[PDB]
Amino acid sequence: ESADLTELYSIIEKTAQVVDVTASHDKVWPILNAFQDVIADSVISFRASTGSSADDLDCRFTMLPKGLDPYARALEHGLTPKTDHPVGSLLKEVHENLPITSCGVDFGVAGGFTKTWSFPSAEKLGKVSELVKLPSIPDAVAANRDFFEKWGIADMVSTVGIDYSKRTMNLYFGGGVGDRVPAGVFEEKGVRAILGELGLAAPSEELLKFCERSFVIYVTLSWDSPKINRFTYSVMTPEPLGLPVDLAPTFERLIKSAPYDTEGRNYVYGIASTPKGEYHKIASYYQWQK
Ligand SMILES: [Cl-]
């Protein structure tokens, strides 16, 4: 299992360099040791971003087993500090009260431990009605409950992400064989309506074309704002070079020159909309479980 960590660190360091980031051994090695017992059966992917997030590469371990509290593991190994902020208690509340069946963690290769993900199974999704009852939920979830209901997505929460570094939370909708995000969310009229009501940048032509292939969305919320922070459309494809977008040079390099084989595998691509603009994300899959 320690040969696996040496191998993985090498891949982490090399993949970082491909997107102009340098990995921190001092930050990354403790995380590998902390999660050594769940890494072999995990799904490992690397996510690059444009915009401000371009200064780090995210490494994600997902499909982690029930029984691991990934935040508790990070705390125990000194990867992240104890906090009294509600962000620190939300994962346990989510895991008890949504039908969570697996989980994940995210770290910046430079920045260190940053996020957890909590995943229901596709056939039994989470609900905003469950989330609003949790003591540690952002107030902004209930205050925006009608956004989720009007777009028909309230009862199809497919992942809960928690960012401990920025004190934000992502709610994901759609994906896999589960209940589907309504078509209207992805049509031009809906894209314009959603971004308009949330005060986010009007959709670009390339975003509108991208949305035609999207079946997953996610909403970012915080404890310190009553407004949804951003809204992201996601697309899954084994042919990212065929997406109706212009790809950043770093993204092209990640696709063409990652130090591992993406054996006909799916990539996951996102276009986030904020009040100021659009930012892109691409995830490349190093280790996958079939
Ligand atoms: Cl529909």
The residue behind tokens 């940048």 is 201
Query: Among candidates 228, 225, 214, which has minimal Cα distance to 271?
Result: 214
State the DSSP code for 235.
E
Resolution in angstroms for this experimental structure?
1.7
Query: What's the alpha-carbon Rg for the chain, to the nearest Å?
Result: 18
Tell me the C-alpha distance between 18 and 285, whole Å: 15
Tell me the C-alpha distance between 9 and 28, whole Å: 8
How far apart are the CA of 210 and the centre of ligand 1, in A?
18
Q: Which domain holds residue 269?
A: 1-290
Pairing of strands 216-222, 168-173: antiparallel
How many structural domains comprise the chain?
1
How far apart are the CA of 274 and the centre of ligand 1, in A?
25
Q: Output b/e per residue, 146-177; b: 16+ Cβ within 10 A.
A: ebbeebbbbebbbbbbbbbeebbbbbbbbbee
How far apart are the CA of 220 and the centre of ligand 1, in A?
23
Tell me the C-alpha distance between 119 and 102, whole Å: 5
Tell me the C-alpha distance between 281 and 246, whole Å: 12
How far apart are the CA of 178 and the centre of ligand 1, in A?
13
Query: Among candidates 82, 114, 107, which has minimal Cα distance to 24?
Result: 107
Tell me the C-alpha distance between 260 and 99, whole Å: 34
Which H, E and C letters describe 91-140, residue by residue? HHHHHHHCCEEEEEEEEECCCEEEEEEEEECCCCCECHHHHCCCCCCCHH
Approach to solving: X-ray
Tell me the C-alpha distance between 87 and 140, whole Å: 13
Amino acid identity at 188? E
Tell me the C-alpha distance between 159 and 100, whole Å: 9
DSSP sequence for 170-227: EEEE--TTS----GGGTSHHHHHHHHHHTTPPPPPHHHHHHHTT--EEEEEEESS-SS
Structure tokens at 247: 């790809």
Q: State the first-to-last Cα distance of the chain, in angstroms, to the nearest integer.
A: 20
How far apart are the CA of 182 and the centre of ligand 1, in A?
4
How far apart are the CA of 213 and the centre of ligand 1, in A?
14
Structure tokens at 195: 């971004």
The residue behind tokens 């199809």 is 156
How far apart are the CA of 244 and the centre of ligand 1, in A?
23
How far apart are the CA of 152 and the centre of ligand 1, in A?
9
276's CB contacts (< 8 A; 6+ apart) are 201
Q: How many Cα neighbours within 13 Å face the side chain of 282? A: 24
**Rama region for 175: left / alpha / beta (φ>0; ψ in -120 to 50; rest):** left
Which H, E and C letters describe 12-54, residue by residue? HHHHHHHCCCCCCHHHHHHHHHHCHHHHCCCEEEEEEECHHHH
Structure tokens at 209: 């074309």
Q: How many Cα neighbours within 13 Å face the side chain of 173? A: 23
How far apart are the CA of 180 and the centre of ligand 1, in A?
7
